[PDB]
Amino acid sequence: IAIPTNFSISVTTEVLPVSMTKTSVDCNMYICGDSTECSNLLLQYGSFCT
Amino acid sequence: KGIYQTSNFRVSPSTEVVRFPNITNLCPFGQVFNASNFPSVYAWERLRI
Numbered sequence A: 001i002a003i004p005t006n007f008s009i010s011v012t013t014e015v016l017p018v019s020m021t022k023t024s025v026d027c028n029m030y031i032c033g034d035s036t037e038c039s040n041l042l043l044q045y046g047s048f049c050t
Numbered sequence B: 001k002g003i004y005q006t007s008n009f010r011v012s013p014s015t016e017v018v019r020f021p022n023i024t025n026l027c028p029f030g031q032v033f034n035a036s037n038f039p040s041v042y043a044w045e046r047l048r049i
C-alpha cells in the first residue's frame, strides 16, 4: 500500500459567463428609416416586428 | 404597469426644401427635333448635350 506523508494546498481559478448584453431594435427606422412611402407598405406585412 | 419602448409619432416633416444648380438657358430641342436631313440608320450620329 502507498500512504502519503505530506500534503500541499492549492488554489484553482475557473471562470464561466453569467449574462450577455441587452439589445433592442426598431423596425420602422431599420427597414425604412424616415421614408413614409414604405411605412404603409411595412404595415401590410403583419405583426412580425411585434 | 411597466416600462415600454415607443416609436416615432411626435415629429413629422412638413417643409419642402429644394436646391438646384444655377443652370438657366433653354436646352436645344429645336436643332435636334426640327432639323433637316437626318442621316440614315447605318450612319447614325452622336450628339453630346
Ligand SMILES: *[C@@H]1O[C@H](CO)[C@@H](O)[C@H](O)[C@H]1NC(C)=O
Pocket (backbone or CB within 6 Å): A005, A006, A007
Ligand atoms: C511538507 O511540505 C512543506 C512544503 O514544501 C514543507 O515545508 C514541510 O517541511 C514538508 N513536511 C515534511 C515532514 O517534510
Ligand SMILES: *[C@@H]1O[C@H](CO)[C@@H](O)[C@H](O)[C@H]1NC(C)=O
Pocket (backbone or CB within 6 Å): B034, B035
Ligand atoms: C419647324 O418649325 C417651323 C416653325 O417654327 C415650321 O414651319 C416647320 O414646319 C418645322 N419643321 C418641321 C416640323 O419639320
